[PDB]
Design a protein around this ligand. Structure first.
Ligand SMILES: *[C@@H]1O[C@H](CO)[C@@H](O[C@@H]2O[C@H](CO)[C@@H](O[C@@H]3O[C@H](CO)[C@@H](O)[C@H](O[C@H]4O[C@H](CO)[C@@H](O)[C@H](O)[C@@H]4O)[C@@H]3O)[C@H](O)[C@H]2NC(C)=O)[C@H](O)[C@H]1NC(C)=O
Ligand code: NAG
Ligand code: NAG
Ligand code: NAG
Lengths: 287, 158, 290
């Protein structure tokens, strides 16, 4: 009796983020042991529709007025299969920049993650109106796994705003295995709570290729380059073995179906990439 | 000698904006006599030429000045010169019905106040130390705008 | 007696509490079309991100996005190719006109000797009215003829252009070129200038490099030049899109150039040319690699 995976897809928005006249909700129940599944639809706790069908999958679509949807009601897709409930819920996505606040949530450095083996995600909140012990920041793991030990920095910026930080330490394995990290900001000003997530980047990986170069210069000093290419999460880390500022590095740019240059003025060009085999590192050298 | 009052108080308005000068009377725009007798002079949909020295009389009463601007943010002000303890209102005003967000006032360089939406300064007890060069930062239609600076000065008098 | 495809995009839904997923799926539903050859192009804000090709049927293509990426308010398109397409963004606010004004290419300026500055106006309301664009020379001398090309954008905004041709000498002798944007919406007129860059110059250094699959990869490190304004191209004159180039970054400045050229071009022979203002001879440094 393999358990079904339940997710809701909705109508997309105008190229200009405008709402459809009518919003379709699609309930995807997929990847379960062929049996008798039934999908109950629940508008804010009350049944709106029912559907029953007998490693397959099934779908059940529910439609909504643009106004009904904007009513910020909470819709629940309730799969009952082999005598056990599964569900997913949704409502109109709350305003993400409430009163204009912004909250950013970093991914770990591929260096921070494999070399230093001490990963940290950081939740940043800017443009806050200055307050005191009003501002609460709260971490949580998607799994439900426990969480403790997090920074809190409520420091005050030049332009009159409050900028709150909270750096949380994260387990490489936990991360690597697709964990999802939630950062939850509450405030007496905000009508609700801001919330940002972050997870291991989806898609197929591909290890890097590296190339240490040089072209001796005219007190004559010689310059060193590196072409780390064809890797498949943008997330990469480059260093020369030497300080992380004695060299410069371009931003990743998609090649022929990414790549980075590294310029070291002064040996070894190390690429710390997630896909890279064996220690999670490719690298080369130049004379 | 009568004095000239402005409603609203702002001696700096936007184009198209109104304002009413209150004071069997004569009016003096730029120096030229206006064709208005009423004690109150009306200004509908301001044009640029509506700028300039104004004054009234029944014994001739001194001048008040009205600037007209077209722009995104106008730092309006109650009075440009005040005497201690008198009311002073500051107002970061935005073009038309347009909405100015993330508004911050600056006095002499420093961040006086910031708020998510628009706000105004109001002092019932104009502190002599308030004299400063003011200006206000805003956000209109997602874009950044700094207001034209405005010098303001209080006067403590024995 | 066929039937075009129906193109719609489904997106990931929110938390019961209206919060965004970590990643955001975009599902492209190409449906109800006569069995043929269909290729799906994925456009991030006018740029290709992914392409597939599948051969009365239906088919699906999926794009995944960082919750950050998504929250960037970029406009993703699904382009089924004759062309059909649907586009979505984070459900939203209006945004006023911005106006940019380019400097001429050091190549456009010395090599091609046919300089052009371009005034760009974006985020216009298509219903706001019509946008007058106006050139003027600091001096006073009349401007030449400005080509005005408009392109109603995918995200609902108007994007007006006006490319003005400019005299090399006029430029070289410190002229200042004004671009003046007027509109019924704007309380005033946008105004952008551009002139020959002040500051001390310094000619570039160049280095053509070569790497060890069986396709080609070629690099170039043009460095230590002293106006950011530089031009890079690879000859053989290979196309300005067959290679990529980094932005200048103070080191002087520097740029990398990446030219992938088939081992078939390895069978004919190349050249990395830097067209820089300070560059000595014909205003060009350059090198090569085997
Ligand atoms: C009384 O005297 C005052 C001065 O004491 C005088 O005020 C002046 O008004 C003129 C306009 O007549 C102002 O000049 C303007 O400056 C602005 C600056 O942004 C320009 O934009 C204006 O040009 C616009 O208007 C043109 C024609 O209307 C348009 O074709 C053009 O597109 C512009 O939109 C204009 O040049 C000047 O700044 C003030 N001076 C002061 C001190 O305020 C007023 O005109 C006099 N009134 C009477 C009735 O005598
Ligand atoms: C205020 O200044 C801080 C510090 O530089 C910056 O983080 C923030 O973006 C600014 N807020 C505004 C005005 O957007
Ligand atoms: C300005 O005056 C005119 C005439 O009274 C009127 O059309 C307009 O609504 C007024 N603006 C105000 C008071 O908001
Ligand atoms: C709409 O698209 C163009 C690029 O395709 C961009 O320049 C413009 O700013 C966009 N408007 C937005 C994202 O608000």
């Amino acid at each position: 009796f393999t358990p079904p995976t339940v997710k809701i897809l909705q109508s997309s928005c105008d190229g200009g983020g405008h709402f459809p006249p009518t919003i379709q909700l699609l309930c995807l129940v997929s990847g379960y042991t062929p049996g008798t599944i039934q999908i109950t639809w629940l508008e804010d706790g009350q049944v709106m529709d029912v559907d029953l069908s007998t490693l397959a999958s099934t779908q059940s679509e529910l439609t909504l007025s643009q106004k009904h949807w904007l009513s910020d009601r909470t819709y629940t897709c309730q799969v009952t299969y082999q005598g056990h409930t599964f569900e997913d819920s949704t409502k109109k996505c709350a305003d993400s920049n409430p009163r204009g606040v912004s909250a950013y949530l970093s991914r770990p450095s591929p260096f921070d993650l494999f070399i230093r083996k001490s990963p940290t995600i950081t939740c940043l909140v800017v443009d806050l109106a200055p307050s005191k012990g009003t501002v609460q920041l709260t971490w949580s793991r998607a799994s439900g796994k426990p969480v403790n030990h997090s920074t809190r920095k409520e420091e005050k910026q030049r332009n009159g705003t409050l900028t709150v930080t909270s750096t949380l330490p994260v387990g490489t394995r936990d991360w690597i295995e697709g964990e999802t990290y939630q950062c939850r900001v509450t405030h007496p000003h905000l009508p609700r709570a801001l919330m940002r997530s972050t997870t291991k980047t989806s898609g197929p990986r591909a290890a890097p290729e590296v190339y240490a170069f040089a072209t001796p210069e005219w007190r004559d000093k010689r310059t060193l380059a590196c072409l780390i290419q064809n890797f498949m999460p943008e997330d990469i880390s480059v260093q020369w073995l030497l300080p992380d500022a004695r060299h410069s590095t371009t931003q990743p740019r998609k090649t022929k179906g990414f790549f980075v240059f590294s310029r070291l003025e002064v040996f070894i060009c190390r690429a710390v990439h997630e896909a890279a085999s064996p220690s999670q590192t490719v690298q080369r050298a130049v004379s | 000698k009568p004095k000239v009052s402005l409603n609203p108080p702002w001696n700096r308005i936007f184009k198209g904006e109104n304002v009413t000068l209150t004071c069997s009377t004569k009016w003096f725009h730029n120096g030229s006599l206006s064709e208005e007798t009423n004690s109150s002079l009306n200004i509908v949909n301001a044009k640029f030429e509506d700028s300039g020295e104004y004054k009234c009389q029944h014994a001739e009463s001194e001048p008040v000045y009205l600037e007209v601007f077209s722009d995104w943010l106008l730092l309006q002000a109650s009075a440009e010169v005040v005497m201690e303890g008198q009311p002073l209102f500051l107002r970061c005003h935005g073009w038309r019905n347009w909405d100015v967000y993330k508004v911050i006032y600056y006095k002499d360089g420093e961040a006086l106040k910031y708020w998510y939406e628009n706000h105004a300064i109001s002092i019932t007890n104009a502190a002599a130390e308030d004299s400063g060069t003011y200006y206000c930062t805003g956000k209109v239609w997602q874009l950044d705008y700094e207001s034209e600076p405005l010098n303001i000065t209080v006067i403590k008098a024995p």
